[PDB]
């Protein structure tokens, strides 16, 4: 019982950052300044094999762990920020982006505003690979 002094039905908002690449997925809950961390669970903390770290199932399992610990914290409603790798690398989200968001909603948490925060360069440094690209 470490929550704040509010009514039984009041909504206390936090922010969840969902970082879904093609190798892993992060579920990270902070406050509105991003300075304090409540819980952080990744897809690699729930599976045993490297190839399964980015699966939608691993992302869903990580989300349910987050919801259980948030009840201890006293957080009820989460604003959502989503991102891909970005920079000079790919801009499309990984497989576990949608599963993590759905699992949070179905676990009893209220969803606020959603925003995509992938880093986008106005001008950029050269990316890896040659001028010939990756040759498979």
Partner 1 sequence: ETMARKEWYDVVAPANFEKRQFAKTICNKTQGTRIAADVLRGRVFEANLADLNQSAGEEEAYRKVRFTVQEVQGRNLLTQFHSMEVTTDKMASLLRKWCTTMETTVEVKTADGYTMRLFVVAFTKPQANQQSRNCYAKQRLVKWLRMRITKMIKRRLSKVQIKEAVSLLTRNVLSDALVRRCNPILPLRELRIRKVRVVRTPKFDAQALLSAHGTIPASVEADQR
Partner 2 sequence: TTKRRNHGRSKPAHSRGRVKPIHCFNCGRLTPKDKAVGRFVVRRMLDAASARDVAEASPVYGANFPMPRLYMKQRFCIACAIHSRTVRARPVGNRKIRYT
Partner RNA sequence: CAGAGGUGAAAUUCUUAGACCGCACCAAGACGAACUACAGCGAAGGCAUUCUUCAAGGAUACCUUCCUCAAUCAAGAACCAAAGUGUGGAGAUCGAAGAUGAUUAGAGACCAUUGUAGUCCACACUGCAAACGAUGACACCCAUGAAUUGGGGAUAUCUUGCACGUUUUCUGUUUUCACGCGAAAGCUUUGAGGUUACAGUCUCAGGGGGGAGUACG
The partner in contact with residue 111, picked from partner 2, partner 1, RNA, none with C-beta cut-offs of 5 to 8 angstroms by kind, is partner 2
Residues contacting partner 2: total by CB under 8 A: 26
Residue among 4 and 129 whose Cβ is closer to partner 1: 4
Residues 99-128 within binding reach of RNA (CB under 7 A)? 117, 120-128
Taking CB atoms within 8 Å and a gap of at least 24, the contacts of 118-122 are 118/83, 118/84, 118/85, 118/86, 118/91, 119/83, 119/86, 119/87, 120/86, 120/91, 121/87, 121/88
Does residue 51 belong to the site contacting RNA (CB under 7 A)?
Answer: yes
Rounded Cα distance between 136 and 134, Å, is: 6
The partner in contact with residue 110, picked from RNA, partner 1, partner 2, none with C-beta cut-offs of 5 to 8 angstroms by kind, is partner 2
The partner in contact with residue 12, picked from RNA, partner 1, partner 2, none with C-beta cut-offs of 5 to 8 angstroms by kind, is partner 1
For 37-71, b/e burial (b = at least 16 CB within 10 A) is: ebbebbbbebbeeeeebbbbebbbbbbeebbeebe
Does residue 22 belong to the site contacting RNA (CB under 7 A)?
Answer: yes
Q: Which residues of this chain interact with partner 2, rule CB under 8 A? A: 77, 82, 88, 90-92, 98, 101-102, 105-106, 109-116, 127-129, 131-134
């Amino acid at each position: 019982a470490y929550g704040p002094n509010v009514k039984k039905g009041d909504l206390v908002y936090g922010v969840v950052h969902i970082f879904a690449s093609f190798n892993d997925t992060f579920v990270h809950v902070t406050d509105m300044s991003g300075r304090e961390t409540y819980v952080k669970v990744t897809g690699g903390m729930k599976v045993k094999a490297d190839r399964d770290e980015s699966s939608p199932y691993a992302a869903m399992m990580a989300a349910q762990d987050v919801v259980a610990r948030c009840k201890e914290c006293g957080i009820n409603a989460l604003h959502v920020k989503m991102r891909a790798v970005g920079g000079v690398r790919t801009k499309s989200p990984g497989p576990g982006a949608q599963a993590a968001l759905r699992a949070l909603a179905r676990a009893g948490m209220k969803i606020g505003r959603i925003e995509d925060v992938t880093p986008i360069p106005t001008d950029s440094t050269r990316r890896k690979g040659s001028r010939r690209g990756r040759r498979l």
